[PDB]
Amino acid sequence: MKPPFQEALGIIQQLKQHGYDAYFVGGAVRDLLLGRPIGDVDIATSALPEDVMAIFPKTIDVGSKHGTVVVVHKGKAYEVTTFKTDGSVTFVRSLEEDLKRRDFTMNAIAMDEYGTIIDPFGGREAIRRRIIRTVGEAEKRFREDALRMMRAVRFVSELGFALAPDTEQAIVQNAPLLAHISVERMTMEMEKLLGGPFAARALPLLAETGLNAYLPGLAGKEKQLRLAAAYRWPWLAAREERWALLCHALGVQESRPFLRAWKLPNKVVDEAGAILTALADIPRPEAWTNEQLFSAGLERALSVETVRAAFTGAPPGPWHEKLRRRFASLPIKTKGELAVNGKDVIEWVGKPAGPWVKEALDAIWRAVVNGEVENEKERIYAWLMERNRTREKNC
Amino acid sequence: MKPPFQEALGIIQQLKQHGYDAYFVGGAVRDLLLGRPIGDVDIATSALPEDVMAIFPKTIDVGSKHGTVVVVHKGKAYEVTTFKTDGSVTFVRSLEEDLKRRDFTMNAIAMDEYGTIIDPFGGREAIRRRIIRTVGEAEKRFREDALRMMRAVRFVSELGFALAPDTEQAIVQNAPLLAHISVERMTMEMEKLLGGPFAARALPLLAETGLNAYLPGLAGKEKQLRLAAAYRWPWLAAREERWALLCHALGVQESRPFLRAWKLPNKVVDEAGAILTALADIPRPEAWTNEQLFSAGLERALSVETVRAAFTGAPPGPWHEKLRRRFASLPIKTKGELAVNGKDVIEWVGKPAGPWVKEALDAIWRAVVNGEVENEKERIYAWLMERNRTREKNC
Ligand SMILES: Nc1ncnc2c1ncn2[C@@H]1O[C@H](COP(=O)(O)OP(=O)(O)OP(=O)(O)O)[C@@H](O)[C@H]1O
Ligand SMILES: Nc1ncnc2c1ncn2[C@@H]1O[C@H](COP(=O)(O)OP(=O)(O)OP(=O)(O)O)[C@@H](O)[C@H]1O
Ligand SMILES: [Mg+2]
Ligand SMILES: [Mg+2]
Ligand SMILES: [Mg+2]
Ligand SMILES: [Mg+2]
């Protein structure tokens, strides 16, 4: 009894004591056997949602309508779900029927309270071989829920299994069925897929299967998805870093409409574009300017250098370290640190408030950051006063 | 900082550090002030669902569509919700706007990370006075969401506050609007209502307001709901015990269609009926038979005696204790313990399998339970053999 299951045992044990019968199901079982770090623990049972909610003190009703109830047990959330047959939903008492309806054999294993693997579909066998194979007829399953095809690919990215020959074939043959699946759902698969350790060969697969060109903005980018195999994807440590690089590798022109079409939240779309733009604007790591670094703020500069690294092969290590150093010597680090205020500039220049003020303050921060003048009132004043009779001597 | 809020502080503190601003809202603030045991802590914030989900490691998406996200923090689930204006939903940045849309002034208080009470609608006053008053126009609020009326009454039951004269008036004037609210939602209110410490006066209230007779099966039971005031409701310790007694007190004829019309889950409807039935079959605590006790199993017998107690005024103490004792001396406690098997009876009586076998086994368990014969094979055999030549001497 490995620690992730050890603590979830309470749940099974209690469902059993009320005469129910429950099992560990899902990736966690897969992971355990595969030797992976264990993902998160799910419990399937013969108990119906209102029974689960009656037995355990804290329960969250996530979706009891399709069998699932969240149980908070000794401090964590677990998803407990009644055994079901995938049509509205029908509940049963057969664990075997509940496994039959699961996507791939690896995912279709179960473990009992005593640690016994129950594996009626040869998932264990598929794990030894490292194969993603559909439970039952590859074709039928994908018709039932086209999204399964997407998962199959991401699983390739996540575990470096290979697609079974006939399962793969089914995908190309059943590609179209995707555009019936709501974007949101595809996005979370894509995101996982990009963060796969094997992302490097999952992107190409996205092309050699029919899946490309039913995914948003991946219309005929087949050439592009193949050359993607050369990108050092796994050093991307962040969501934005990922999307950014995806764009860069697909030669995406305007980041905004694309990342939007994927229904990613605004802040991510923005930040990804930010990185992307910075990267167009700084073509070499030495090229960073106090200005642009200040402008970008340490984090994003770092991400830029990481995304660059994932494209070049040059580890970001040394740059990240110089950026960290530079940033911490920037005479000011935010605009709010500026020792001088918009209203000061007004009193000094005898001009009424307006759009010239921004321009002033802008020229000032830059001058402070470039260290042309200290961040102190008296010295900016002189600086500004003297630079206003220079604009007179020029035109 | 009381312990319920102490641990939730983290959530606020983090939302604030990302520059958001969040408050403790809801019953828990009310509870705190009223001096009650604190119900469960909720957080309202200016941050949007996707921000909350971004900041906190474990999050459950219960309903981000209307602003709510559950955050698992240091081992508990908390409901975090973006400030909103009740129409689709509009998110704002005003805490004041978010409180304005809540049901009653007691429920519309707020507390900040430093323990400051923010109370723009005089909830604090309404607590001092012990009054349920609508936030804003009593009439308008009930039109917006008729369920509010139900809550007001259950809160009466839960806190012993009185309804404000004009709020009450609004209920009678706006009673009809209930039949637009789905039963399920009324059921959970009713259930709380029945388990109030003041249930004794909430049920009558249900009648003196127009609410009665838009609640299922409470058509013109006005007379009955008033006399309900005399029932010792607060000793009912269980859901079934409650419904049971509610039936008994409404003179409900057939338990089953009634409890069903309330959409309670089946096991409850069943068990309630069980208790109710046993109660019609045993009119005095002394009257319990080894038979009927064995037939009911300790739990239910106890529940019967408690439901009786709530109707009579005689404390169930002594009976509960004798039942516990009797049940633990029942020669067998389940039908499975019987020392003799259906197939034994066939071999013994030379008759083919069939419906007479049940009848035999039935007569046997009863005889064991009544202690007419030991629960042992050899002795049941004789008992049965000798009782089969008695049915010959009789007809
Ligand atoms: N689209 C689907 N069709 C059939 N079964 C599915 C589908 N999606 C999920 N499942 C089943 O339920 C589980 C889904 O859980 P989930 O997708 O969270 O984790 P997992 O696939 O097991 O691994 P991971 O934790 O990495 O995501 C799978 O184990 C599989 O049994
Ligand atoms: N129908 C409604 N109309 C307006 N506001 C509501 C409504 N239902 C709930 N609320 C608001 O949200 C909170 C709902 O919390 P909830 O019903 O869970 O607990 P509570 O009423 O505050 O007290 P308790 O924990 O005992 O139930 C209330 O405090 C109130 O602010
Ligand atoms: Mg999983
Ligand atoms: Mg978990
Ligand atoms: Mg509450
Ligand atoms: Mg809580």
From Swiss-Prot, chains A, B:
Keywords: ATP-binding, Magnesium, Metal-binding, Nucleotide-binding, Nucleotidyltransferase, RNA repair, RNA-binding, Transferase, tRNA processing. Signal peptide: none annotated. SUPFAM superfamilies: Nucleotidyltransferase (SSF81301), Poly A polymerase C-terminal region-like (SSF81891). InterPro entries: Bact_CCA-adding_enz_type3_sf, CCA-adding_enz_C, CCA-adding_enz_firmicutes, NT_sf, PolA_pol_head_dom, PolyA_RNA-bd. HAMAP family: CCA_bact_type3. Catalyzes the addition and repair of the essential 3'-terminal CCA sequence in tRNAs without using a nucleic acid template. Adds these three nucleotides in the order of C, C, and A to the tRNA nucleotide-73, using CTP and ATP as substrates and producing inorganic pyrophosphate. tRNA 3'-terminal CCA addition is required both for tRNA processing and repair. Also involved in tRNA surveillance by mediating tandem CCA addition to generate a CCACCA at the 3' terminus of unstable tRNAs. While stable tRNAs receive only 3'-terminal CCA, unstable tRNAs are marked with CCACCA and rapidly degraded. ATP binds at G27, R30, R102, D145, R148, R151, R154. PANTHER family: CCA TRNA NUCLEOTIDYLTRANSFERASE 1, MITOCHONDRIAL. Its cofactor is Mg(2+). CTP binds at G27, R30, R102, D145, R148, R151, R154. Pfam families: PolyA_pol, PolyA_pol_RNAbd, tRNA_NucTran2_2. GO terms for molecular function: ATP binding; CCA tRNA nucleotidyltransferase activity; magnesium ion binding; tRNA binding. This is CCA-adding enzyme. Homodimer. One of its GO terms (biological process) is tRNA 3'-terminal CCA addition. It comes from the Bacteria. It is an enzyme of class 2 (transferase). The crystal structure reveals a seahorse-shaped subunit consisting of four domains: head, neck, body, and tail. The head domain contains the nucleotidyltransferase activity. The neck domain provides a specific template for the incoming ATP or CTP, whereas the body and tail domains may be involved in tRNA binding. The record marks E144 as: Involved in nucleotide selection. Belongs to the tRNA nucleotidyltransferase/poly(A) polymerase family. Bacterial CCA-adding enzyme type 3 subfamily. CDD domains: NT_ClassII-CCAase. Mg(2+) binds at D40, D42. Its EC number is 2.7.7.72.
